[PDB]
Amino acid sequence: TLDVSRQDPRYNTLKHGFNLRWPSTDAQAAGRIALCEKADDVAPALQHIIDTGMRPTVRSGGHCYEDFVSNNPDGAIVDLSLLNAPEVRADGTVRIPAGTQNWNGYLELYKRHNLTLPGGSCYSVGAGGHICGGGYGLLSRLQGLTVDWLSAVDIVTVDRQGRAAPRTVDATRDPELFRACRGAGGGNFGIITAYTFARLPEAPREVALATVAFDWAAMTPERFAELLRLYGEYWETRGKDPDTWGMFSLLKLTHRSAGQIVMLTQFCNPDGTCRDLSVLNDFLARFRACALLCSKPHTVVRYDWLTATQTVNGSGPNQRGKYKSAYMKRGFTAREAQRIYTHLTRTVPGIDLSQSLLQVDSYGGAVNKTERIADTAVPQRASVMKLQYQTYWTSAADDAGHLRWIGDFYRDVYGTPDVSAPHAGTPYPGDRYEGCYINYPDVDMLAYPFWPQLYYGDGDLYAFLQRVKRRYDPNNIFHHAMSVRP
Ligand SMILES: *Cc1cc2c(nc3c(=O)[nH]c(=O)nc-3n2C[C@H](O)[C@H](O)[C@H](O)COP(=O)(O)OP(=O)(O)OC[C@H]2O[C@@H](n3cnc4c(N)ncnc43)[C@H](O)[C@@H]2O)c(*)c1C
């Protein structure tokens, strides 16, 4: 372990992660970062921190949207980012240590055994937060969530007597903690050192990437509603069919100041080839090219899968971000389409909303296996679209404008009629929505006493997680603004 305290030249860099908002103040910053050099460092590093009464937060790839890692006033960040070399065995079993970044992981899994894991696209996201939060990406309609493949988890927990020790959890060993590690989100129960997979799916051989853009200059409320109708009605119907599960679409409903709305679709057949583009052609044909809604000319480019996966792996700039999430079981209502149009066309004097957007992901397919409700901590297994509201900016001086823009936008979309008065402002689970995604955490939801039901559903999961919390972190060593409460 390397100790990076405030005397160390690395401190100013290592006190933060990807989102430059955190820590908000120097007072809130960690006093030190414990950079673990091997898995065997983790329990002793943790033991040293808690033995002094200091609080640990936990970092792997640093991508947390919220202050969960970096807001730890004069505490210790236990950093597992150097624990990054996957083990891909000749028998196809895989171990992904927590610091493995998504793209490095895809390269290793692909080259060593023609395997992949259906997680996120961003190159720099770490396994540690990503997988236990229920990570998904462009292959998840085909192959399900990252957590749907997990066979075992190596985790350091702290017992009632305050002793940190490694354990391995799986279907028969601490099975309730295993289930919690399959989606509940990080920084809750202990420090995951590695994820084990008895089997992974084969990497696809070939994909097509289709880009369809729409000029904002021509985008009326009616054309915008037609775009949302065509897209959402597809995922609610045809997109449930298995022959479509290799198709994954990102509709970037940009703020008007971005100039264009962009839809990026990846496609393979279920067998991982592009032997038949019919499903993609049929999907794209719903979006008529100009040369009433009409698009810029469609671009469809074929790649081998690894090459496409590299070309889409960007993380965007290192800057300030605010994010929100919603799971949709249905197409857009006319009221949703109108409220979204309102906020995407709203001018806010003194701030640049050109990087801001509502992203609407195709969802469901192989995710939507109800047997995973009982053995994972991802209860949202009936959604057809997954939404990520995003605003990005450079300067702390502009925080208030950006937070207000995205806060008002979200509250309005999920307001009265489509949502009950008691839950208004949230995509509360029911006939229309399935709530929120813990890997896109939103501390604005702490304003609502029912925030745990947004993330963990209206059923018994949160109480289950509270029981795991009492059993495996009885001292509440591991916490943050949205951690499972004892
Ligand atoms: C920055 C970023 C995030 C993205 C991106 N694209 C995603 C995508 O395509 N699919 C997704 O499903 N999610 C995407 N996300 C969001 C990420 O999934 C989340 O931001 C992950 O939680 C990030 O994980 P990581 O990079 O490890 O982030 P940290 O900030 O280190 O920790 C997050 C969270 O988890 C806890 N924690 C970290 N490490 C551990 C370990 N080893 N054990 C337990 N708990 C751990 C932290 O306490 C914190 O709560 C694309 C981009 C650009």
Residue numbers in the entry: 2 to 292, 314 to 508
Authors' account:
In this study, we report the biochemical and structural characterization of a recently discovered carbohydrate oxidase from the bacterium Ralstonia solanacearum, which is a member of the vanillyl alcohol oxidase flavoprotein family. Due to its exceptionally high activity toward N-acetyl-d-galactosamine and N-acetyl-d-glucosamine, the enzyme was named N-acetyl-glucosamine oxidase (NagOx). The structure can be divided into two major domains: a substrate binding domain (S-domain) formed by the C-terminal part of the protein sequence and a flavin binding domain (F-domain) at the N-terminus. Steady state kinetic analyses revealed that non-acetylated hexoses were also accepted as substrates albeit with lower efficiency.
NagOx formed large rhomboid-shaped yellow crystals with 19% PEG3350 and 0.19 M sodium nitrate that diffracted to 1.5 Å resolution. Even though, according to size exclusion chromatograpy experiments, the enzyme showed a monomeric conformation in solution, two NagOx molecules were present in the asymmetric unit. Inspection of the structure revealed that the isoalloxazine moiety of the FAD cofactor is bicovalently bound at the interface between the F-domain and the S-domain. The FAD cofactor is bicovalently bound via 8α-N1-histidyl and 6-S-cysteinyl linkages with residues His64 and Cys123, respectively. The isoalloxazine ring is exposed to the solvent area at the bottom part of an open active site, while the ribityl and ADP moieties of the FAD are embedded deeply in the F-domain. Other amino acids that form the active site adjacent to the redox-active isoalloxazine moiety are a string of tyrosines (Tyr66, Tyr137, Tyr345, Tyr414, Tyr459, and Tyr462) with several neighboring polar residues (Ser122, Gln381, Asp383, Gln410, and Gln412). A short stretch of residues (292–313) is not visible in the electron density, which suggests that they form a flexible loop with a disulfide bridge at its base between Cys291 and Cys316. In the active site of NagOx, a molecule of ethylene glycol and glycerol are bound, providing a hint about how NagOx may interact with its carbohydrate substrate. The ethylene glycol C1 atom is 3.0 Å above the N5 atom of the flavin. The O1 atom interacts with Tyr462 OH (3.1 Å) and Gln410 NE2 (3.2 Å).
